Design a protein around this ligand. Structure first.
Ligand SMILES: CC(=O)N[C@@H]1[C@@H](O[C@H](C)C(=O)N[C@@H](C)C(=O)N[C@H](CCC(=O)O)C(=O)O)[C@H](O[C@@H]2O[C@H](CO)[C@@H](O)[C@H](O)[C@H]2NC(C)=O)[C@@H](CO)O[C@@H]1O
Length: 174
């Protein structure tokens, strides 16, 4: 739903903070959650750590809007489903998030929201989609080698996303 983006993104920026660089962790340095590879994709060239450190909130917002929200068709997903899919997309990429949403609603997992995906999403209850997608996300994260390091924090993140998504799903302005 269109109005979810303005509601969800302040929580993303709040939960992320500014520049975070833990070089002993995989993924590399981030600013407001934006990684170096994602900024490189935006700029059309491999950027430096200093460029990530200097990232503006305006550019971060454009990146989240165009390369995450729009790549999961957030405007067109049901309220709540949009938020659950967006956070998964932020954490693991839009293709993996949409593939898991497609697995939940029972369509071909190609990572892109098309007509068959929208039809199957709108045939199911929104809070059921939210719960099954967050469960499928947890099951998928447990297969990663990095789960031994980040799993407890990941589990807490999914729980908070599931709660806010189900809330958005019953927000009368969405
Ligand atoms: C420790 C931790 O959670 N760090 C994450 C960090 O994610 C690291 C790289 C990660 O490991 N995420 C796990 C969940 C994951 O999905 N790993 C698979 C492994 C597949 C396999 O092993 O087969 C992968 O890396 O693909 C994540 O950055 C996102 O990383 C995705 C995957 O790279 C990109 O698609 C996204 O565009 C990118 N988002 C933005 C806004 O830039 C960032 C977001 O704020 O917040 C934390 O810093």
């Amino acid at each position: 739903a269109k109005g979810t983006f303005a509601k969800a993104m302040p929580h993303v920026f709040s939960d992320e903070g500014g520049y975070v660089d833990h070089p002993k962790d995989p993924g590399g340095a981030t600013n407001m959650g934006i990684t170096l590879a994602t900024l490189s994709a935006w700029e059309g060239r491999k950027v430096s750590k200093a460029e990530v450190k200097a990232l503006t909130k305006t550019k971060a917002t454009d990146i989240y809007r165009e390369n995450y929200w729009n790549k999961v068709a957030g405007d067109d997903l049901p309220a709540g489903v949009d938020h659950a899919t967006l956070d998964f997309a932020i954490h693991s990429g839009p293709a993996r998030a949409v593939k898991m949403l497609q697995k939940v609603v029972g369509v071909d997992q190609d990572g892109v929201i098309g007509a068959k995906t929208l039809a199957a999403v709108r045939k199911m209850a929104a809070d059921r989609i939210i719960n099954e997608l967050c469960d499928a996300r947890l099951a998928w994260l447990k297969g990663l080698g990095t789960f031994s390091t980040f799993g407890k924090g990941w589990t807490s993140r999914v729980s908070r996303v599931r709660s806010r998504a189900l809330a958005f799903s019953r927000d009368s302005a969405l």
